[PDB]
Amino acid sequence: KTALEMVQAAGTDRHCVTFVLHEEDHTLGNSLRYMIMKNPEVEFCGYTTTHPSESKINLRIQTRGTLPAVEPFQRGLNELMNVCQHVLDKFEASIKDYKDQKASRNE
Amino acid sequence: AGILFEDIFDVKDIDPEGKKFDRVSRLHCESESFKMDLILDVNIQIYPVDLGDKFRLVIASTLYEDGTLDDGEYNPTDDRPSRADQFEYVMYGKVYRIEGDETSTEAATRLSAYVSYGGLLMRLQGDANNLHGFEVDSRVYLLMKKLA
Amino acid sequence: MIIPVRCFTCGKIVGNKWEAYLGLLQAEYTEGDALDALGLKRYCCRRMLLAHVDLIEKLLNYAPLE
Amino acid sequence: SMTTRGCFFTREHYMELVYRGLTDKVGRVKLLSPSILKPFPLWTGKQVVSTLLINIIPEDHIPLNLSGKAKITGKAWVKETPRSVPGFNPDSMCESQVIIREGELLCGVLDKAHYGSSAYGLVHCCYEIYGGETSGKVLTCLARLFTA
Amino acid sequence: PLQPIPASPPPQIPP
Amino acid sequence: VKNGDILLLNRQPTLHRPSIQAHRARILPEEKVLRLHYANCKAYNADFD
Amino acid sequence: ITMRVPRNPTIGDKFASRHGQKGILSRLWPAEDMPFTESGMVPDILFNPHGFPSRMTIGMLIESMAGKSAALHGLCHDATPFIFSEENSALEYFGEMLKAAGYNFYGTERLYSGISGLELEADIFIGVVYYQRL
Amino acid sequence: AWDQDRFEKNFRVDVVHMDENSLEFDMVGIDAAIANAFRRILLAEVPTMAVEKVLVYNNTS
Amino acid sequence: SYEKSELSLDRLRTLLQLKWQRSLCEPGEAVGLLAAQSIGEPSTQMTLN
Amino acid sequence: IAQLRPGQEIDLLMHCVKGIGKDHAKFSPVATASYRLLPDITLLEPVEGEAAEELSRCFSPGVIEVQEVQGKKVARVANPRLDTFSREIFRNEKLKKVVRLARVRDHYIFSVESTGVLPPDVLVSEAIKVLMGKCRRFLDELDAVQ
């Protein structure tokens, strides 16, 4: 029941390896990537969709130094989720603001 | 220090063959000190340039003022005193063809430099010794800064 | 045959405007105004009514009525 | 559309195209350097398509030269009349002739000739001197880039 | 003497 | 058959040497119709109609 | 006995316009992907442009612009041959309509990609083309 | 590079109209490849209920 | 000419001669069928008229 | 749903279930969901004289407010948001450079249209929730593999 799995490159190890998510689209594989990009230690980061009649993508990550890519990967996940959390907070705040306002307007 | 050439420049006429692109202009410019002649392409979108403008030109083989030739690949985070920080315009380059001298020449006066920066063409001509170091397969970094 | 439920291109619910369509017909609007007042803006939903042709009010006559 | 005198991609776009059109089986992927370097590390499409060669022409050998021609004449985008000046000619330093030198295109479009099936083409000559499989790989990968 | 016909071509131009 | 495999094709009537060209194998579920390169039309005098 | 069978357009079946431009059903492509116009609508049939040089098919162009003009204003437009002289051509009168309606004269309109999210520089041409099954 | 607070200083969500079955709100300050993700998730992911099995007794229409 | 050109007037000769010896058709291929098709294609391509 | 004539009848017994919007198309909770980037109309020249007539007709219904500081109409933008890029400015050889049409970089504008299963607010909230939950899934998986 895999939902994330990596195949270790022949050329080197743990600064260029490539990931294989499962069950996905151009949503994650095009938000997550943009998020990883900001990180400055990474050399190459790109994605593809191996197969139209399947739903799994391919993630490629390459880094200057000798630290593996697991670190940029994980920090990217974290960055994105904290972003969404803040966005949702501001969203609902603004929602209830304008709702109570609209009620106040017509009373 | 590796200044392979340097000069000050102001332009005489910008595009003498119509405007037939979107992002480039085909400059025709001349030096005053030495009777060189510069034909160069310059992105006017992200670097507006006019007719009467003056600018100083240099052409380095490395941007380090330690003059060492250590270049693998431009690493974007790095910072240390490079020759760029005084200019306004950078371009990587490659020289691919030098024309003007055919035979065993008794007076090689007119020699030209043909450079194209990844797609923007550049033509400079002049003497045959000032314009030296210019082998084939010879990376240079154009630099430039508009001068009053 | 009978009016389809959800529009083809986008997805709006259009499987109800038909009756009110004939209604605002009897009140004599030029159809442009009728499809306006019925609240349809993007044209890919308007060509779902400006050009439907009903085939059960012309096909029931052969009913095996009793 | 791509390979003509200007189409500027910033970094993330560049890496994107290059990965899309590269039939992931590879391993360690190479790179290039920004053509222009002043404000933001821009690129140019020729730089892009060159990467596909540099990674697709096996590590053993080295890329290759050419100076042939291309279908669109020099006078496809011409305008009325030059500012009457001799010396420069519309004949050389033009965009009608691919001048690939060591696997990095330097001027000129890719027109029908080269990727087309005619004598003296790009996929034409690749096959003669590298083998077959590498020519086929060039064809498929170049097509993928051209769609994406 | 001969007989004429009207000419249709130019139709309603936009509202 | 797997992806490492290859198949053979022919056309009536049989004209020439590129009349039978071999192409690698790859699976694709939602297909009722065969697929081929367009410019390779001159390899089979193809019509596709 | 009289059976009934269902047949739905599968991949590989045919279509056809009203000018011989016979097509075929290539592949299905989820709606989350296709472009979306400025006003949020989503094409449902994509059409390769490489045809019309070497088809002389100008019916498709003029009558697609027509389909849009109609569905916008509300009325049905006539299409009999020999009416529109060289004097007042079809295209000109028939784009004057989209002009006074509010779209671009040449029947094009901007469009956004569906995988990047980025606008596309070169505008796109959209219309409403009658489609017979075969 | 990335920095939370630099961003969070910028983000604001202005609403211009809501009524029943409608909404319109400016998301000024986010990058394309997230807005696209929101639109995709809407048109494809918010689960819903629906009919998927009909049993027939005596259809004579 | 300007003549950077690291190559001698005999490597060139050896090179062209090797390209020749390379370009000869190996034994093995039945040339008769080859000619049969090569006239068969204009036998089919006769149809311009 | 149907239409009958005397003598005919129906008898159904449905069966409802749960699902997502990509497993099928009878699950989209909204009609539309889009975004256009705020257009930004900058007069690279002050437009004047009688241009007002054709400008006001060069654009969307209310954009340029003819303004008469001296009874003489001048133009300025009422709302640059209310336009769809008619681009009907270019057909006049003269007014192709006295204006400028473009986009502000990142000023998206959603617009949601619910069917009625839920009002659009809960929709947006739920969308964000599922994005975040997906990412949590991936992260915790990466954690529990090491």
Side-chain angles (χ1 to χ4, degrees):
Chain A
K1 43 167 183 62
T2 312
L4 171 49
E5 180 176 0
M6 307 173 177
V7 185
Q8 323 191 9
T12 49
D13 76 312
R14 299 198 325 286
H15 36 84
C16 73
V17 71
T18 288
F19 309 155
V20 171
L21 307 195
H22 272 229
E23 329 286 308
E24 198 60 30
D25 52 9
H26 291 295
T27 317
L28 205 52
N30 193 28
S31 41
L32 171 60
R33 183 207 56 105
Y34 165 92
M35 212 57 221
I36 279 175
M37 153 62 212
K38 302 305 209 154
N39 178 10
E41 305 278 19
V42 298
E43 162 179 3
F44 196 48
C45 51
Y47 87 111
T48 196
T49 64
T50 172
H51 190 67
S53 73
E54 297 169 350
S55 44
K56 69 186 202 301
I57 68 175
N58 283 167
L59 203 49
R60 163 61 61 106
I61 170 68
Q62 282 189 30
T63 45
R64 317 203 154 289
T66 73
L67 83 168
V70 178
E71 289 293 331
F73 181 68
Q74 183 153 354
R75 209 213 289 202
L77 290 208
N78 288 148
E79 285 157 297
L80 172 72
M81 289 204 270
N82 310 345
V83 168
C84 269
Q85 163 57 25
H86 160 85
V87 161
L88 163 60
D89 303 321
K90 271 297 289 291
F91 168 53
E92 264 152 343
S94 60
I95 279 302
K96 92 171 190 47
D97 302 339
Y98 181 76
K99 251 182 169 182
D100 291 71
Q101 186 38 267
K102 185 205 189 204
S104 63
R105 294 306 172 186
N106 204 346
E107 58 179 355
Chain B
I3 292 177
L4 265 287
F5 170 51
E6 192 206 327
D7 198 335
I8 196 175
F9 275 97
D10 192 295
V11 195
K12 316 297 182 301
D13 206 355
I14 307 300
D15 270 336
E17 289 75 35
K19 203 276 188 172
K20 51 199 187 67
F21 269 94
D22 51 355
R23 294 222 165 116
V24 190
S25 52
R26 173 47 59 104
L27 267 77
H28 152 78
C29 170
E30 163 198 17
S31 43
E32 301 105 2
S33 68
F34 302 153
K35 312 303 107 177
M36 335 296 289
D37 41 350
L38 192 44
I39 281 281
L40 171 61
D41 296 311
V42 178
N43 179 347
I44 76 166
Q45 167 198 6
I46 64 192
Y47 202 96
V49 283
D50 320 308
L51 176 62
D53 183 280
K54 202 172 65 161
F55 40 87
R56 164 143 87 94
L57 198 148
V58 69
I59 291 168
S61 185
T62 183
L63 210 65
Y64 279 162
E65 280 179 348
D66 80 340
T68 321
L69 281 294
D70 311 326
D71 164 72
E73 158 76 22
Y74 172 70
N75 185 22
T77 190
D78 257 348
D79 210 341
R80 76 186 71 187
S82 66
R83 226 175 320 268
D85 300 327
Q86 315 80 65
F87 288 88
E88 309 170 350
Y89 201 121
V90 190
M91 282 184 285
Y92 206 88
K94 203 152 178 180
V95 195
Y96 68 102
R97 165 187 202 73
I98 310 306
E99 189 164 353
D101 185 8
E102 312 303 330
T103 186
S104 159
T105 298
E106 310 76 19
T109 63
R110 290 295 89 193
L111 258 73
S112 57
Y114 281 165
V115 197
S116 287
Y117 308 124
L120 274 80
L121 187 146
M122 186 270 270
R123 170 180 168 185
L124 176 82
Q125 208 156 10
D127 305 338
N129 200 0
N130 292 114
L131 307 97
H132 202 79
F134 299 80
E135 299 195 356
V136 288
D137 308 341
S138 62
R139 315 186 192 287
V140 311
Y141 304 178
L142 187 148
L143 279 78
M144 169 166 160
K145 166 184 74 179
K146 271 155 61 179
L147 272 188
Chain C
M1 217 175 283
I2 198 60
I3 190 82
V5 183
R6 297 153 157 264
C7 169
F8 276 150
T9 289
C10 67
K12 193 184 294 294
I13 278 296
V14 80
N16 77 353
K17 293 310 194 314
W18 191 230
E19 298 297 330
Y21 190 23
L22 297 178
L24 265 73
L25 272 185
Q26 305 329 317
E28 298 303 326
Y29 294 122
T30 72
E31 270 84 8
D33 306 337
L35 284 154
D36 276 21
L38 268 192
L40 288 186
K41 197 50 95 180
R42 47 195 60 95
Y43 56 91
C44 83
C45 275
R46 271 152 61 120
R47 64 83 169 152
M48 280 286 324
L49 298 185
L50 198 74
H52 181 231
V53 76
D54 191 300
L55 274 72
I56 218 156
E57 265 153 39
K58 186 157 199 168
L59 197 148
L60 272 190
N61 284 349
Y62 309 82
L65 82 160
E66 184 268 1
Chain D
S1 59
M2 283 172 68
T3 81
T4 172
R5 187 77 74 174
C7 53
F8 289 146
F9 313 160
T10 181
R11 176 160 187 262
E12 57 288 39
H13 300 180
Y14 153 70
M15 288 179 298
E16 183 47 47
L17 305 174
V18 176
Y19 190 35
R20 183 67 74 82
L22 256 173
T23 185
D24 180 10
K25 286 284 96 182
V26 195
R28 178 161 187 72
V29 174
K30 304 300 280 181
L31 263 191
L32 280 182
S33 188
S35 162
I36 280 184
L37 196 41
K38 177 257 298 172
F40 315 97
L42 289 195
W43 258 248
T44 47
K46 284 76 59 186
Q47 201 87 260
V48 192
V49 49
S50 55
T51 316
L52 295 161
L53 300 169
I54 302 307
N55 303 96
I56 206 64
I57 302 163
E59 85 294 26
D60 188 302
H61 322 99
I62 295 90
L64 63 161
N65 275 98
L66 190 84
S67 315
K69 260 275 198 174
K71 178 170 290 291
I72 50 171
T73 70
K75 252 197 187 169
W77 33 71
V78 78
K79 295 299 151 301
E80 59 99 17
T81 302
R83 279 67 157 178
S84 302
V85 162
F88 81 97
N89 40 10
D91 302 334
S92 312
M93 307 310 285
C94 181
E95 199 173 11
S96 59
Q97 46 189 4
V98 52
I99 45 183
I100 160 177
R101 196 165 302 270
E102 206 258 334
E104 316 210 334
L105 195 156
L106 285 170
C107 299
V109 310
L110 256 68
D111 205 2
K112 179 262 180 189
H114 315 71
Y115 41 73
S117 68
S118 175
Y120 208 97
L122 203 152
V123 193
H124 179 230
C125 53
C126 285
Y127 162 65
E128 192 166 7
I129 72 191
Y130 282 119
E133 45 200 3
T134 83
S135 90
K137 290 185 178 307
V138 167
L139 187 50
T140 184
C141 300
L142 214 44
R144 280 189 201 173
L145 170 65
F146 280 134
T147 81
Chain E
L2 315 161
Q3 61 261 13
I5 200 67
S8 300
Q12 155 76 34
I13 78 179
Chain F
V1 174
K2 64 190 57 182
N3 51 296
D5 289 22
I6 198 147
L7 268 45
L8 302 94
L9 322 169
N10 194 356
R11 188 254 191 193
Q12 274 197 61
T14 70
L15 311 190
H16 44 54
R17 177 179 206 253
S19 80
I20 50 164
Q21 193 172 275
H23 283 72
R24 316 182 292 163
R26 268 195 276 175
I27 67 167
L28 209 161
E30 51 96 20
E31 306 291 20
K32 193 259 285 183
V33 65
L34 293 201
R35 310 291 180 174
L36 167 58
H37 194 208
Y38 295 65
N40 277 115
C41 182
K42 44 185 205 305
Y44 316 84
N45 199 326
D47 313 287
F48 276 13
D49 274 294
Chain G
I1 291 177
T2 168
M3 311 297 187
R4 72 187 156 198
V5 185
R7 294 280 195 82
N8 258 297
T10 66
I11 170 173
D13 206 317
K14 277 81 82 177
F15 274 68
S17 160
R18 266 192 300 180
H19 324 268
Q21 275 282 2
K22 168 178 178 184
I24 205 178
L25 199 73
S26 321
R27 172 209 284 279
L28 309 164
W29 210 241
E32 69 174 9
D33 276 338
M34 299 287 185
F36 47 87
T37 325
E38 191 69 21
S39 312
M41 88 198 89
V42 180
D44 42 3
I45 211 162
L46 298 167
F47 189 14
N48 170 33
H50 289 241
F52 310 159
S54 70
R55 290 289 184 277
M56 304 309 109
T57 46
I58 307 307
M60 285 199 74
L61 273 43
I62 184 73
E63 80 93 15
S64 154
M65 173 205 300
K68 179 175 309 153
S69 49
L72 270 187
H73 264 257
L75 75 163
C76 268
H77 268 285
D78 64 347
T80 65
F82 308 94
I83 318 298
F84 292 127
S85 295
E86 183 270 355
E87 194 285 322
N88 49 356
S89 162
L91 267 56
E92 66 96 22
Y93 149 87
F94 216 104
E96 180 33 63
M97 183 151 290
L98 295 205
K99 163 78 153 72
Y103 282 63
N104 186 357
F105 190 98
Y106 309 135
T108 63
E109 51 194 72
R110 321 307 321 286
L111 184 64
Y112 292 6
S113 161
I115 301 187
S116 91
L118 278 84
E119 202 269 351
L120 314 189
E121 312 84 17
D123 50 317
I124 305 305
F125 169 76
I126 298 177
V128 174
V129 160
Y130 198 45
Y131 249 70
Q132 305 149 356
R133 192 181 169 189
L134 252 70
Chain H
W2 188 227
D3 204 16
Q4 300 290 103
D5 309 332
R6 182 264 311 270
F7 156 61
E8 301 192 326
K9 176 179 65 65
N10 322 128
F11 196 97
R12 56 198 194 95
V13 163
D14 289 331
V15 163
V16 78
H17 194 299
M18 163 158 82
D19 63 56
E20 177 58 25
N21 306 318
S22 316
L23 190 46
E24 197 170 359
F25 56 95
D26 299 336
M27 261 194 66
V28 192
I30 197 49
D31 200 80
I34 286 168
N36 195 343
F38 285 172
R39 165 192 85 110
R40 290 171 70 75
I41 285 305
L42 268 190
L43 299 198
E45 289 317 305
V46 188
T48 307
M49 294 291 291
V51 190
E52 281 202 43
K53 265 278 210 204
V54 184
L55 301 197
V56 173
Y57 301 134
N58 180 9
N59 173 18
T60 54
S61 41
Chain I
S1 313
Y2 170 67
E3 182 259 330
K4 213 52 168 191
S5 46
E6 200 276 337
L7 198 153
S8 71
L9 276 192
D10 203 359
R11 313 269 46 71
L12 176 59
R13 314 269 322 287
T14 51
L15 172 83
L16 269 56
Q17 293 187 333
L18 262 172
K19 212 45 165 64
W20 179 280
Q21 183 183 1
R22 281 175 84 102
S23 198
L24 62 89
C25 292
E26 60 251 5
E29 70 156 354
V31 286
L33 278 301
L34 278 51
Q37 294 168 1
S38 50
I39 205 176
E41 307 166 349
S43 86
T44 58
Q45 290 205 359
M46 192 91 177
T47 172
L48 276 81
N49 205 26
Chain J
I1 286 185
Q3 197 139 349
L4 292 200
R5 283 302 197 267
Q8 317 165 270
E9 80 280 21
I10 327 172
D11 268 331
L12 293 317
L13 211 66
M14 276 155 259
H15 264 253
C16 282
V17 290
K18 181 183 190 185
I20 64 169
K22 208 184 310 170
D23 185 281
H24 207 260
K26 53 173 166 177
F27 288 68
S28 164
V30 299
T32 83
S34 82
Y35 49 84
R36 85 208 183 87
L37 293 84
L38 168 61
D40 45 359
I41 297 94
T42 58
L43 314 191
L44 308 183
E45 284 203 4
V47 302
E48 44 205 357
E50 313 312 324
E53 54 173 358
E54 29 200 351
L55 270 190
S56 159
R57 289 184 309 285
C58 267
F59 292 109
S60 292
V63 160
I64 73 157
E65 35 186 356
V66 284
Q67 44 184 14
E68 305 76 47
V69 287
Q70 291 287 351
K72 148 61 181 60
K73 311 168 299 188
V74 189
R76 79 158 299 271
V77 294
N79 177 18
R81 160 195 282 220
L82 272 194
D83 196 358
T84 62
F85 264 90
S86 71
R87 299 190 69 203
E88 291 265 356
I89 204 71
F90 303 125
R91 279 179 51 242
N92 197 338
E93 49 81 29
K94 182 190 70 63
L95 294 100
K96 291 187 289 182
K97 329 175 189 62
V98 312
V99 302
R100 195 197 80 98
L101 269 169
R103 307 267 156 132
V104 166
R105 272 307 99 196
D106 282 12
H107 203 105
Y108 291 141
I109 300 171
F110 276 61
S111 310
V112 172
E113 305 284 338
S114 69
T115 54
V117 195
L118 303 100
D121 46 9
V122 179
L123 303 182
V124 184
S125 180
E126 263 284 327
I128 277 166
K129 276 297 195 59
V130 73
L131 171 52
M132 182 172 305
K134 181 90 79 186
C135 274
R136 294 287 146 186
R137 159 172 84 122
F138 264 117
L139 180 141
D140 309 329
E141 178 71 20
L142 188 87
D143 193 4
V145 62
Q146 285 180 336

